[PDB]
Design an enzyme around this catalytic site. Structure first.
Site, PDB file in Angstrom:
ATOM      1  N   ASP A 267      -7.996  54.695  49.512  1.00 19.00           N
ATOM      2  CA  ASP A 267      -9.366  54.188  49.569  1.00 19.00           C
ATOM      3  C   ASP A 267     -10.278  55.164  50.313  1.00 19.00           C
ATOM      4  OD1 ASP A 267     -11.731  52.786  50.076  1.00 19.00           O
ATOM      5  OD2 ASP A 267     -10.702  50.925  50.611  1.00 19.00           O
TER       6      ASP A 267
ATOM      7  N   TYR B 143      -8.295  38.240  49.130  1.00 20.95           N
ATOM      8  CA  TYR B 143      -8.449  39.527  49.819  1.00 20.95           C
ATOM      9  C   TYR B 143      -9.928  39.740  50.172  1.00 20.95           C
ATOM     10  CZ  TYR B 143      -8.917  44.559  50.517  1.00 20.95           C
ATOM     11  OH  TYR B 143      -9.243  45.797  51.008  1.00 20.95           O
TER      12      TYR B 143
END
EC number: 5.3.3.1
Lengths: 124, 120
Positions: free
Chosen positions: A39, A15
Site C-alpha cells: 500500500d 475493514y
C-alpha cells in the site's frame, strides 16, 4: 477460500469501518499473522502483524473512510472494493480515492492485501 | 511496466470506451501475445489471442459500459477501476485490475465480480 462471496462482502465492508474509526488493533486482527500488505501497490510488501500494525499506526495513528461502490467478491476467497479516505494533511482536508484487493485464507483472515492508488488519486 | 500513472489511467479508460462501443478487434489489439484474462477472477486463466478474441466475441458479440469511479493507477504499470456493465436487461458491477507491459499492452487482466454484483 473459506469465506463465501457474501462473507467476503462482509469482511471487506468491516475493514473500511475499522479504518474509519481507527481501531488499529482490530484491523491488525483481521490480518493473517503472516499476511503481506502492499500500500500503495508497487511499493515493497510489508510482512507480518507487527509490521502491519506499525504501518496502520503511522497512517491512522482524524481520518474518515467509506465505500464509494459495492464490494466485488469472488468464489475463491478474494474481493475488491473502491473507497475514499479523508484525512488532514498540514491542517488541511484531503481526499484519496483507492481500490483494495484482498485474498483471505481458510480461517477468514486477510492473507494478502493490495491498495491501488497514486498521486493522481489525491485531491482537496 | 513502463506506462506511467497517467498513461495507465488513459489506457484503462480507453478499454472501457472500446467495450462500450463493442469493437472487439480494437479491444483485442490492446492485449499482448502472452496476455491472460481472468473474468470473473477465480475462473481459469484464458490465454491466446484467438481465445481472448473469442471471449469478447461471446460477451459483446447491445452491451454498454461506463466507469463509476476514477481509475486508480500505480507507478509499476498497474491499475484498478470500478465500472458497470449493462446487458442481458440487467446490470453488473465490476472491478478490473490490469497490468501493462513495457509496450503499453495488457499483460494481465483480472475482473472481480460475482452473482451478488449482478442486478436485474
Amino acid at each position: 477460500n473459506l469465506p463465501t462471496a457474501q462473507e467476503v462482502q462482509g469482511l471487506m465492508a468491516r475493514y473500511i469501518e475499522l479504518v474509519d474509526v481507527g481501531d488499529i488493533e482490530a484491523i491488525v486482527q483481521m490480518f493473517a499473522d503472516d499476511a503481506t500488505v502492499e500500500d500503495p501497490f508497487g511499493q515493497p510488501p510489508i510482512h507480518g502483524r507487527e509490521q502491519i500494525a506499525a504501518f496502520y499506526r503511522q497512517g491512522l495513528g482524524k481520518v474518515r473512510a467509506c465505500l464509494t461502490g459495492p464490494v466485488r467478491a469472488s468464489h475463491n476467497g478474494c474481493g475488491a472494493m473502491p473507497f475514499r479516505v479523508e484525512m488532514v494533511w498540514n491542517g488541511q482536508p484531503c481526499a484519496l480515492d483507492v481500490i483494495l484487493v484482498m485474498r483471505f485464507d481458510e480461517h477468514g483472515r486477510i492473507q494478502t492485501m493490495q491498495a491501488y492508488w497514486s498521486e493522481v488519486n489525491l485531491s482537496v
